[PDB]
């Protein structure tokens with residue numbers, strides 16, 4: 153009645169059929185044997201795995217409500233503990249998601265206000281890149297510093313200074329723990345956390361980075377508290393603190409300190425690392441494909457010129473750039489196995505029975521590479537998103553933000569950011585790699601919770 157799967161063993165589950173370094177390939181390999189909907193045992197964790205566009209959409213959209221539970225990610229769980237918008241369920245989820253979305257729009261998200269803040273931050277990126285003077289640099293932290301400062305404005309009320317030493321450490325905490333969950337040990341940790349949380353190893357260093365992140369947010373919330381102005385909130389924290397006061401006499405409130413810290417961390421973390429990873433990966437692809445870089449240039453120069461900052465609406469007259477960013481997001485597949493769902497009630501899903509509470513892995517990468525939707529899914533080709541007339545072409549299999557009732561509500565911000573950061577950088581610079589285009593390796597460094605591109609250095613050269 154449960155979907156079919158390989159026969160597990162007590163405690164280790166499907167250990168023998170799973171290569172923890174490449175969980176994605178391991179899971180896809182077994183679906184070729186059992187079909188697109190199958191059961192797996194990640195140690196004692198029983199998970200139903202959804203592969204391909206059809207399986208994922210049918211579950212997460214067509215049976216949207218039944219599949220709207222949030223599952224676990226054991227590493228982030230160590231810090232969040234089911235608190236915060238991301239890992240919440242039921243009433244907690246309802247309240248915090250609703251609140252978060254509204255307060256984000258209230259601070260400019262999806263509006264003129266945050267476009268300007270992205271624009272301003274992009275100029276600061278251009279300045280920093282200008283300052284390198286075309287030298288061979290690691291782009292990692294130039295990018296993350298810029299991305300992070302958009303969401304930081306919303307939640308903390310101001311950007312960090314680029315020379316802020318603490319800001320860099322915050323960014324390292326985010327990079328290191330994100331990377332960890334993408335490694336072989338990280339993915340083993342998803343199977344065996346009940347043991348591994350108490351053992352020495354890479355898990356502990358990731359925990360202490362998560363701890364550093366929690367500590368800063370806690371600290372920021374306290375400062376905000378002692379200086380709070382109930383009539384004029386400066387940031388996301390303030391709005392949340394204001395609601396906490398309004399709800400002090402409701403004993404079943406979801407608005408209390410721990411949910412504040414964790415939601416704030418959720419957004420600071422998700423609002424920094426993913427766009428940063430996507431950008432980092434984008435530029436590596438662009439250097440691998442010099443001819444794609446040239447069309448991006450051709451379009452930018454013809455549509456925007458050189459004398460003004462790119463803006464969000466330039467999107468509509470830039471089908472190629474839109475296709476390029478989509479392909480980067482499709483190819484880069486930053487969240488390859490989505491973020492775990494779970495069934496809200498006993499569920500009938502296409503001839504299978506899934507008991508209430510059953511965890512679900514929506515294999516987002518398998519949709520992004522679904523051969524029914526993209527002609528050459530393993531290649532980087534912006535034509536995946538283009539008409540024969542050269543106009544932009546939507547895809548139902550373009551699901552990097554996932555789909556359904558618990559989909560990424562940072563999508564708006566992220567789309568704007570990607571459009572602005574990519575265009576403004578490509579407008580002002582051309583890219584020079586350390587190695588020859590043929591020698592560049594755009595295969596991932598790590599694939600686990602996230603897809604991480606290999607470490608590289610590069611030059612940003614003025615046009």
Ligand code: HEM
Pocket residue numbers: 222237238239249303418419422423424426427430486487490491492516552553554555556557558559560561562563565566
């Ligand atoms: C390229 C950029 C991004 C990608 C690819 C991405 C991807 C994802 C994915 C795959 C999920 C799981 C959705 C699901 O459960 O079906 C998710 C959830 C989430 N993301 Fe993003 N994200 C991005 C940027 C952002 C940003 C900028 C923010 C904050 C402004 C953000 C905040 C969140 C939150 C709060 C959730 C959980 C929503 C919930 O549980 O209700 N993300 N994201």
Ligand SMILES: CC[C@@H]1C(=O)OC[C@@H]1Cc1cncn1C
Pocket residue numbers: 228238417418419421422423425426491560
């Ligand atoms: C680590 C970032 C977010 C968090 O706090 O816990 C899980 C979540 C993952 C995520 C959501 N949107 C983008 N990412 C990378």
